[PDB]
Design an enzyme around this catalytic site. Structure first.
Site, PDB file in Angstrom:
ATOM      1  N   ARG A 255       0.839  -1.180   0.000  1.00 44.93           N
ATOM      2  CA  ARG A 255       0.000   0.000   0.000  1.00 44.93           C
ATOM      3  C   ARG A 255       0.878   1.236   0.000  1.00 44.93           C
ATOM      4  O   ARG A 255       1.797   1.352   0.819  1.00 44.93           O
ATOM      5  CB  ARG A 255      -0.943   0.003   1.207  1.00 44.93           C
ATOM      6  CG  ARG A 255      -1.734   1.275   1.285  1.00 44.93           C
ATOM      7  CD  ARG A 255      -2.927   1.178   2.211  1.00 44.93           C
ATOM      8  NE  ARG A 255      -3.352   2.527   2.558  1.00 44.93           N
ATOM      9  CZ  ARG A 255      -3.877   3.392   1.701  1.00 44.93           C
ATOM     10  NH1 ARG A 255      -4.154   3.048   0.451  1.00 44.93           N
ATOM     11  NH2 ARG A 255      -4.114   4.637   2.102  1.00 44.93           N
ATOM     12  N   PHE A 256       0.598   2.150  -0.922  1.00 44.23           N
ATOM     13  CA  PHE A 256       1.201   3.476  -0.873  1.00 44.23           C
ATOM     14  C   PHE A 256       0.263   4.388  -0.079  1.00 44.23           C
ATOM     15  O   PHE A 256      -0.573   5.117  -0.622  1.00 44.23           O
ATOM     16  CB  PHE A 256       1.468   3.994  -2.278  1.00 44.23           C
ATOM     17  CG  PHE A 256       2.499   5.071  -2.325  1.00 44.23           C
ATOM     18  CD1 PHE A 256       3.142   5.477  -1.159  1.00 44.23           C
ATOM     19  CD2 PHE A 256       2.823   5.694  -3.516  1.00 44.23           C
ATOM     20  CE1 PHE A 256       4.094   6.483  -1.183  1.00 44.23           C
ATOM     21  CE2 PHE A 256       3.776   6.703  -3.547  1.00 44.23           C
ATOM     22  CZ  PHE A 256       4.410   7.096  -2.380  1.00 44.23           C
TER      23      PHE A 256
ATOM     24  N   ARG B 231      -0.282   2.113 -11.435  1.00 40.88           N
ATOM     25  CA  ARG B 231      -1.226   2.520 -10.401  1.00 40.88           C
ATOM     26  C   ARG B 231      -1.999   3.785 -10.756  1.00 40.88           C
ATOM     27  O   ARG B 231      -2.974   4.114 -10.072  1.00 40.88           O
ATOM     28  CB  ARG B 231      -0.478   2.705  -9.080  1.00 40.88           C
ATOM     29  CG  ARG B 231       0.283   1.442  -8.658  1.00 40.88           C
ATOM     30  CD  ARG B 231       1.247   1.706  -7.507  1.00 40.88           C
ATOM     31  NE  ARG B 231       2.122   0.568  -7.249  1.00 40.88           N
ATOM     32  CZ  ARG B 231       2.124  -0.148  -6.136  1.00 40.88           C
ATOM     33  NH1 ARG B 231       1.311   0.132  -5.128  1.00 40.88           N
ATOM     34  NH2 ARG B 231       2.973  -1.165  -6.024  1.00 40.88           N
TER      35      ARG B 231
ATOM     36  N   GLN C 271      -5.826  -3.520  -8.660  1.00 41.72           N
ATOM     37  CA  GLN C 271      -5.960  -3.013  -7.296  1.00 41.72           C
ATOM     38  C   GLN C 271      -7.022  -3.786  -6.525  1.00 41.72           C
ATOM     39  O   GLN C 271      -7.966  -4.352  -7.097  1.00 41.72           O
ATOM     40  CB  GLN C 271      -6.304  -1.519  -7.254  1.00 41.72           C
ATOM     41  CG  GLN C 271      -7.634  -1.175  -7.891  1.00 41.72           C
ATOM     42  CD  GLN C 271      -8.012   0.269  -7.670  1.00 41.72           C
ATOM     43  OE1 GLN C 271      -7.215   1.058  -7.161  1.00 41.72           O
ATOM     44  NE2 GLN C 271      -9.232   0.624  -8.044  1.00 41.72           N
TER      45      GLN C 271
END
Ligand SMILES: *[C@@H]1O[C@H](CO)[C@@H](O[C@@H]2O[C@H](CO)[C@@H](O)[C@H](O)[C@H]2NC(C)=O)[C@H](O)[C@H]1NC(C)=O
Ligand SMILES: *[C@@H]1O[C@H](CO)[C@@H](O[C@@H]2O[C@H](CO)[C@@H](O)[C@H](O)[C@H]2NC(C)=O)[C@H](O)[C@H]1NC(C)=O
Ligand SMILES: *[C@@H]1O[C@H](CO)[C@@H](O)[C@H](O)[C@H]1NC(C)=O
Ligand SMILES: *[C@@H]1O[C@H](CO)[C@@H](O)[C@H](O)[C@H]1NC(C)=O
Ligand SMILES: *[C@@H]1O[C@H](CO)[C@@H](O)[C@H](O)[C@H]1NC(C)=O
Ligand SMILES: *[C@@H]1O[C@H](CO)[C@@H](O)[C@H](O)[C@H]1NC(C)=O
Lengths: 188, 188
Positions: free
Chosen positions: B103-104, B122, B167
């Site tokens: 996770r960013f 992303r 995602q």
């Protein structure tokens, strides 16, 4: 999950071809396990192992033959991710003009990927890394010149790869998409 | 599609902050356009441009404010790909134990990605490359210790990125998935 054989172990190539003539070229001198020196791959990536943590012999035992095919056992349903109710996660998606897609394979087939997605995301078996040329003879890259629809969806993990890139199943083959003015190849 | 401004052009930073004090740090001294020297990125990739071929000013004009938000305009429907009939390409997928996701962002949010998927997949805006530390304070990597279901699907192209990674929208936030014994963080 990791292979119990050490880095100093001579038994690492147990249950493989064990071909002294090729052992510098292919892992264990076994072409099915891919090359000793990897060419292109399109830091944290260390989390992933070419064999998904198994040992070469155990890898071949899990993924190869098993049925009588004499080749790899492929994932169900063309390798799309399958949802909890048993249906692929995929739908018709229209590729916009200017989109880059690529194919690891000749223009006969009907499968494409977002351009330069990483090898590990395609869930391809390791024998496909067997390449000396910078870029394989069959690897192609294309731009979408004219919009069209594909069956698009996530790639299931398989062959010890994490998968979970995205793939496009086309409804005509790539050669036809070129001919009808949808895909334009590009060169280097 | 490419920016008409040349490499020798002084007008490349037209329509941006144009801050001489930061111009060595951010493109055009404008933090929204990201850094001049990119840190980590998780050959052929040249096909992709940080701004999707637009010029900095034109990039900001297409993607920023536009509504009154005073920030980026995000894609519809949490950024999932949207099929030709208007429905996201996404379904409930059960993450197997041992899967690596990342996770960013901090453990408050409910979005994850296959570990080490490339930034360009992303569809994040360039301001998120503003990082000096090797790995950002909020970037986290996890292994799935206990199976659970997520809404999984392809990422739509946006902010000039090609997107088309995958995602995971979780149903509890990441902190909760850690607490209940589903996600285990890992360190370096
Ligand atoms: C190791 O691999 C090599 C390379 O393919 C094999 O060498 C061939 O062996 C066949 C046996 O019928 C010969 O006809 C070929 O001329 C050989 N080619 C080369 C280039 O050496 C070898 O058989 C393999 N080793 C084992 C034990 O099977
Ligand atoms: C260029 O960016 C710098 C860095 O943020 C800005 O410098 C600040 O300017 C404000 C103006 O109110 C001062 O109060 C701060 O002390 C300054 N900080 C630093 C570190 O210099 C600067 O304003 C920007 N340039 C323009 C033209 O807006
Ligand atoms: C695969 O299995 C079949 C049947 O068990 C066997 O005859 C064959 O030799 C095996 N290996 C290959 C490469 O086909
Ligand atoms: C997708 O496109 C094909 C070919 O045009 C069509 O037959 C099919 O019904 C469409 N819908 C879905 C959900 O795949
Ligand atoms: C965004 O647009 C609004 C309304 O047009 C304007 O007041 C504002 O200054 C613009 N910029 C930002 C960063 O909010
Ligand atoms: C997915 O899971 C959620 C939460 O468990 C559930 O409410 C929903 O109905 C499920 N099905 C789909 C198609 O999302």
């Amino acid at each position: 999950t990791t292979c119990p054989y050490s880095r100093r172990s001579p038994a690492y190539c147990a249950g493989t071809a064990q071909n002294r003539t090729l052992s510098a070229t292919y892992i264990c001198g076994d072409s099915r396990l891919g090359p000793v020196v990897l060419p292109q791959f399109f830091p944290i990536l260390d989390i992933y192992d070419r064999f998904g943590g198994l040992c070469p012999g155990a890898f071949l035992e899990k993924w190869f033959n098993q049925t009588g095919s004499g080749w790899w056992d492929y994932p169900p349903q063309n390798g799309f991710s399958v949802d909890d109710e048993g249906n692929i996660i995929a739908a018709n998606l229209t590729l916009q003009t200017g989109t880059f897609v690529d194919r690891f394979g000749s223009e006969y087939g009907s499968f494409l990927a977002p351009a330069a997605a990483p090898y590990l995301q395609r869930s391809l078996p390791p024998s496909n890394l067997n390449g000396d040329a910078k870029f394989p003879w069959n690897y192609h890259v294309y731009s979408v010149i004219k919009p069209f629809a594909v069956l698009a969806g996530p790639i299931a993990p398989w062959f010890g790869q994490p998968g979970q890139g995205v793939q496009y199943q086309t409804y005509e083959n790539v050669a036809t998409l070129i001919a009808d003015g949808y895909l334009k190849a590009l060169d280097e």
